[PDB]
Every structure is written in C-alpha cells, then in structure tokens.
C-alpha cells in the first residue's frame, strides 16, 4: 500500500477535568512492523511507549507511540515534532502539532419543555444548545439539584459546522428526559458545557419551572416623594 | 408572591413568582410574576450634588436584572470545578437610581480657613457613615 | 468570630448513642486522643476567621458528624459530615519502613500533574 | 481482500417524494477482474443494469448492480432476494432484505428562540426536534411562509438512538437562524418531517411571535400619600 504519518491532539475530557495531556503519533501501512522510529523534540521523561502493532484496512500492521506530559506546556504554546525515520523507507517524513489559535467561545442555551408535553403527565424533554465555537471539541454534562446524573441517561449528538456567516464556527446539541411530576414539584436541572476557549474553562445554565415564561404579570409602580434610599 | 428571583438595590426593583394551583381545571395551573418599582422623585442623575437636574426618565431591562455573573462551585466527578453562570457579563459601571442603606456616599468640598483652602469631606447619607 | 481569636479550639465526635455526647479528639493546647495517634492535627492557619484540622489514614468507620468548639463568649458550633466513597488516593507512599543500625534512609512520595501548580 | 456482498434498502427521498425505488446488490473486494453476474428472485419486467467497477483500497475493486423495480411492490410485503455469481471462491452468495415491521410514529416539536438572543438585535435561532420513531430513516425540511428554503441554510445532525425501556427508538434535531427584522415583523416559519410510519407521510409545525404571549397584565400606579411598602 502507501505509508502515511499522523499526529493527533490530546482529548478534551482528560485535559479539562484532569491535566494529563498525553500525545500520540501513528504510522500505518507497514508489514514488517518491528523496524520503526519515533522522535519528539522535547523528551525529558523520554520513556515514550510503543504498543502492539494492531491491524488496519485488510490486515496491514500499524505502529504508534505515546509521549506522556501534562497541560502547562500545551496551553502555553509549545510545539511537538514527531518524526519517522524507519528503515522500511530510505527517506524520513515529519509532522507537527500545536494548540489552535483564532478561537471563539460558545453560547450556551437551555430550553424549557414544550407546552404539549405537559398535558400527558408522563415524561418531559429538556434541550441544550451550544453554538459558535471555533475548535471542534466540547464537553456536555447534566446535573439534577447538585447531583451529577450518570452518562447513560441522556443522548448527545456530534459537533458539526454551521452555515458560514464569514468565519467557520460549530454547534452541538443534547437532550434529557425526566419525570413529569418532579418537574412540577420544583426540582432544578442544569446543563454544563466545557470548552478550551472559555476563561474559567466552564460555564453553566440552570433552569426550573418558576423561572419561566409567565401567564399572569402584575406590575405596581410606586412614587416616593419621601426618600431615595430603598430599604 | 412566594419566591424571590431578583432583589436589586441599585435600581430598587424586586421580582417574585408563584405557581398558583388554580381551582377550575384542576390539572392545569398558572404562573404568576410580580414586579415592584419604587421611583424616587428627588434624586439626581449622577450621585453628586450639582450634576444635572433631577432624573425624570427611568429605564429597566429585565435581561440585566436577572443577570448572574459571580463564579460558582460545581462537583462534577469527584472534584470541585469553578464555572461562570452567564453569557453576557463583559464589563462599577452601572448607574444607580436610589441609594442603599448599607453603603456610604461622600463628597469633597473646598472651604477657606483664613489662609489657604482645604479638601473637606462631607457625608451625603449620615446614618451609614460612622467609622465602626 | 474574629475578635475572639485569643481562645482555645476543640474538635468533637458526635456519638449519638444514648443521649448525645462530644468526647474530644484534639485541642489547641497540645492534647490528642489515644487511638488517633499519628493521624490528627489542628492548625491555626489560615487564621483571622478560620482554623484547620487534618485527618488522614481514613477507614469506612470514620463516617460521622463532627463539631468544632471554642472557649469564647457566644459559641457558634458548626457541624460537618464525612462520607466515605470509593476510589484510591492521589498521593502514593509505601508501607512502613525499617532501618539498619545507623545508615541513610530514603523515602519517595508521588503526585499527579493536577498538583504541579501547588 | 476478503469478498463480501451486501444490499441496501431504497432511499427515503426517492421513496416519499420521487419515483426511484432502486435496490442495489453489490460486492466489493474481488481477487479477479470484472467478470461478475447477478440474478434476482423476482422477474417483474426489468433487467438489472450494471455499472463499471470503481477504485478501492490497494487493488480491490467494487462491482454493483441496480434493480430498476421502481413500481413499489416493496411496501406490500415482498422479499427481494439477490444472488451472486463470479469466478471467485466457488460458493454463490445470497442475501435477503425486506420492509421492517414494529413501526412507531415520530413526535415533532418546534421550540421558540431564547429571550437572551431576542434582546440583542442579531440573528435568532430556532430548533426542531423529532423523537420516538422506530426505523432510523427520516427527512427534515424547513419553510418560510410557503417557500421552501434551500438546504444550504440550515444544519441537521444524524439520527441516533436514545436510552429507553426496551423498545428501541431514535431521535434527530436541526436548527435554522433567521434575521430579527423578519421575526419581529411577523413572518412565520415551519419545520416539516417525513417518515414511513406516518399515514400521510408528513407533519408540520409552525411558529412566530405571540406564541407564549401572556393572557393577563395588571398595571397599578400607586400615587403619593399612600407609600406603604414593607421589608
Ligand atoms: C459622578 O460624579 C463623581 C463625583 O464627582 C465622579 O467621580 C469623580 O470624578 C472626578 C473627575 O474625573 C475625579 O477627580 C479626579 O481626582 C484625582 C485625584 O484623586 C485627580 O488626579 C484628577 O485630575 C481629578 O481631579 C474624582 O476622583 C472622582 N471620584 C470621586 C469624587 O469619588 C464620577 O466620574 C461621575 N460619574 C459619571 C458617570 O458622571
Ligand atoms: C510544522 O510543519 C509545517 C508543515 O507541516 C512546517 O511549517 C514546519 O515543518 C513546521 N513549522 C515550524 C514553525 O517549524
Ligand atoms: C483579616 O480579614 C479582614 C477581612 O478580610 C482583612 O481586612 C484583614 O486585613 C485580615 N487580617 C490579616 C492579618 O490578614
Ligand atoms: C507499621 O509497621 C510497624 C512494623 O511492626 C507496626 O508496628 C505498625 O503498627 C505499623 N503501623 C500501621 C499503621 O500499619
Ligand atoms: C431471508 O433472510 C433470512 C436471514 O438471512 C434467511 O434465513 C432466509 O432464508 C431469507 N429468505 C429468503 C426467501 O431469501
């Protein structure tokens, strides 16, 4: 076949919640997968591991490496320069990876249940929409009260790019179904979104039934000649 | 009139809400919202003395009264993380319509003492400005 | 209370068996309990409104309600509940070490990269 | 590589709107050259025409064949077996595909924009949601008044399954951003959903302003000489 080289970014779930930002370098398209070479430019804890040469499309071997490290040199803007100088070719090839600039930060919105789900008194739906972020990585969790729900109780879609108003931005969604009775009892729910362009790395919105679109509005304007202190 | 959402004392505005489980059609019910504005008829525009005449126009944006920008604490996995709570708090800078019972408001006036002048400091709300 | 800082501080354990009872575990004078030896201390930092108590070597039977007391005029008594959940510690040390008759010892202690800023 | 043959159900856009019911028995991965022939079990009155092979992974080919039976005996309950024949591993492969049973209807919700977006005079965003439908085949279109908007103006995700109690069901979302002057003038919008288990095969929802407008407003101007507020 044909050899190629790749370098992927560290995953967002272990960069934000933890800090262990391991890297990865992958060459695919070899059938003598013992003679290979990996070299990064910084190596102080230089024990870069290698794994079992797993298969590929139609049973071709594939080698890969992991250089461990944590998140202070990544977020400060360093560079990493993995290279393959294997003897299964007579010329080496190179790649690199850097934290993406030109970022934007998302806008988080929680939407109340629709009006015609509340008649049946069975289960109601809460939608979470996060829009306009320039990298393609995001985290979405849910909380009830102050207790995190387990991940097998909601469904999250993937992140896709939206119709271009000049620059390329992305979007993502998520829904959650809860009981119709305890939404009316007065429980509160939250959608929490994490992305690497936010200043405190996280943001949260909290919704409940009392903080919603009202049916009746009472307005009283009182005119106070007496004082201007507002007790 | 049951649960307080907003109690703002720079503008002196208060918003409450209550689910009124009404009598007729006993499987549906309304959501009521009460807003109370107290308007001062003798305050200035800036809170100093000679600024501009008395304020005659008062504007209230409910998207600004319900705003929440102080960081909070959230226990996600077995961790404490800090998050924000709003999309719009790119920044005090707000104009206040009334005073507040728990804060001093002072001024500076030059007066003469035979020779030179001084920078005499004057309390505008005398109850809240004792050094204690 | 900040203007009552010249007092002595205490640390309870609410038994709750018959009536309700606070045996002491540690005080600011320098007395610790018998069976809490090597795993309890009371520190006056950060000061100025607050003091700090550290309890390690945890077990599943350390769960309970705990009270903090002073000798001041009017007492707040604050309570905290200690729950024990599943997992493993962050720091990692070996067991208990011996020593030969007079030579150099060396003990390590690990930490992850979440504690690198500290 | 290894030889394998699968066949696919017709597309939903051609089965609901158009008239192009085409089943495609195809095998990819052929050690030999283009020398294959296919026969089908019905003989409705059309020849299963073929196309040339394609380019695939490192020497493998991909032959195909389309059954032109666009008269729809598919939704009456046919069975439509295919059969392969090629100078290859000498055991002729067969495969069988039919219409699914145990169908359910989708439930369509169209949500109003968030108020925070409304109070900024820029583009406002709408959300469509369908959930609870049994096969993962669906079509989502948008409308403004009566004009169908072209499909480069909106983003729609894939169709994934949701956590539930036994009976597997699926969900899908979509969004569309419009201008605030068109919303504030009073122009309406619509989300339209096509599924096979709907009896008239389509559903509509419509939204504009005055959707969750309140029913009662009380204004009280309390004059001077009556100021009696409480803490
Ligand atoms: C509302 O009125 C207040 C009170 O007059 C205004 O604040 C004051 O503004 C003046 C002029 O900007 C400041 O005076 C400055 O003093 C420093 C020395 O401290 C000197 O370096 C400057 O040259 C100038 O003389 C004053 O400090 C300031 N603050 C007070 C009195 O607390 C305020 O700007 C007004 N706000 C609006 C929105 O009109
Ligand atoms: C990173 O790679 C790019 C092309 O892949 C090339 O500019 C160079 O090799 C590296 N950049 C720098 C600044 O070294
Ligand atoms: C004690 O706390 C107060 C209020 O935070 C602060 O003003 C004071 O400086 C503190 N004292 C010391 C010694 O840090
Ligand atoms: C530590 O090991 C010594 C060795 O005899 C033992 O006496 C001591 O009780 C041990 N302590 C704990 C907490 O296991
Ligand atoms: C239909 O498909 C099943 C599953 O492979 C198979 O066992 C059966 O023989 C097929 N029937 C026909 C008529 O092709």
UniProtKB/Swiss-Prot annotation, chains A, D:
Cellular component, GO annotation = blood microparticle; extracellular exosome; extracellular region; extracellular space; IgA immunoglobulin complex; immunoglobulin complex, circulating; monomeric IgA immunoglobulin complex; plasma membrane
Q: State which residues carry a glycan (glycosylated).
A: 22, 96
Residue span, Ig-like domain:
3-98, 106-208
Give the location in the cell: Cell membrane
Major localization class: membrane
Q: List the disulfide bonds.
A: 1-58, 25-82, 128-191
Q: Which GO terms describe its molecular function?
A: antigen binding
Q: Which domain of life is it from?
A: Eukaryota
**Subunit structure, as described in the record:** Immunoglobulins are composed of two identical heavy chains and two identical light chains; disulfide-linked. Monomeric or polymeric. Part of the secretory IgA (sIgA) complex that consists of two, four or five IgA monomers, and two additional non-Ig polypeptides, namely the JCHAIN and the secretory component (the proteolytic product of PIGR).
Give the protein's function.
Constant region of immunoglobulin heavy chains. Immunoglobulins, also known as antibodies, are membrane-bound or secreted glycoproteins produced by B lymphocytes. In the recognition phase of humoral immunity, the membrane-bound immunoglobulins serve as receptors which, upon binding of a specific antigen, trigger the clonal expansion and differentiation of B lymphocytes into immunoglobulins-secreting plasma cells. Secreted immunoglobulins mediate the effector phase of humoral immunity, which results in the elimination of bound antigens.
What name goes with this protein? Immunoglobulin heavy constant alpha 2
Q: Which organism is it from?
A: Homo sapiens (Human)
Query: Which residues of the intact protein are shown?
Result: 110 to 325 of 391
From Swiss-Prot, chain B:
Q: Which residues of the full protein are shown?
A: 26 to 159 of 159
Subunit: Part of the secretory IgA (sIgA) complex that consists of two, four or five IgA monomers, and two additional non-Ig polypeptides, namely the JCHAIN and the secretory component (the proteolytic product of PIGR). Part of the secretory IgM (sIgM) complex that consists of five IgM monomers, and two additional non-Ig polypeptides, namely the JCHAIN and the secretory component (the proteolytic product of PIGR). JCHAIN-containing IgM interacts (via CH4 domain) with FCRM (via Ig-like domain).
Q: Spell out the coiled coil positions from the record.
A: none
- Name the GO cellular-component terms: blood microparticle; dimeric IgA immunoglobulin complex; extracellular exosome; extracellular region; extracellular space; monomeric IgA immunoglobulin complex; pentameric IgM immunoglobulin complex; secretory dimeric IgA immunoglobulin complex
* Organism whose genome encodes this protein: Homo sapiens
> What positions does the record give for glycosylation?
46
The entry's localization annotation reads: Secreted
Keyword Flavoprotein part of the UniProt annotation: no
* One GO BP annotation of this record: adaptive immune response
Key word Signal present: yes
- Full protein name: Immunoglobulin J chain
Supply one GO molecular-function term: protein homodimerization activity
Swiss-Prot record, chain C:
State the disulfide connectivity: 12-22
Q: Where in the cell is it found?
A: Secreted
Q: List glycan-bearing residues.
A: 48, 96
Entry superkingdom: Eukaryota
**Residue ranges annotated for the Ig-like V-type domain, each copy included:** 1-85
Could you tell me what this protein does?
A: Through its N-linked glycans ensures anchoring of secretory IgA (sIgA) molecules to mucus lining the epithelial surface to neutralize extracellular pathogens. On its own (free form) may act as a non-specific microbial scavenger to prevent pathogen interaction with epithelial cells.
Subunit structure, per the record?
A: Either free or part of the secretory IgA (sIgA) complex that consists of two, four or five IgA monomers, and two additional non-Ig polypeptides, namely the JCHAIN and the secretory component (the proteolytic product of PIGR). Free secretory component interacts with bacterial antigens toxA of C.difficile and eaeA of E.coli.
The entry's protein name is: Secretory component
Print the organism lineage.
Eukaryota, Metazoa, Chordata, Craniata, Vertebrata
Q: Which residues of the full protein are shown?
A: 374 to 491 of 764
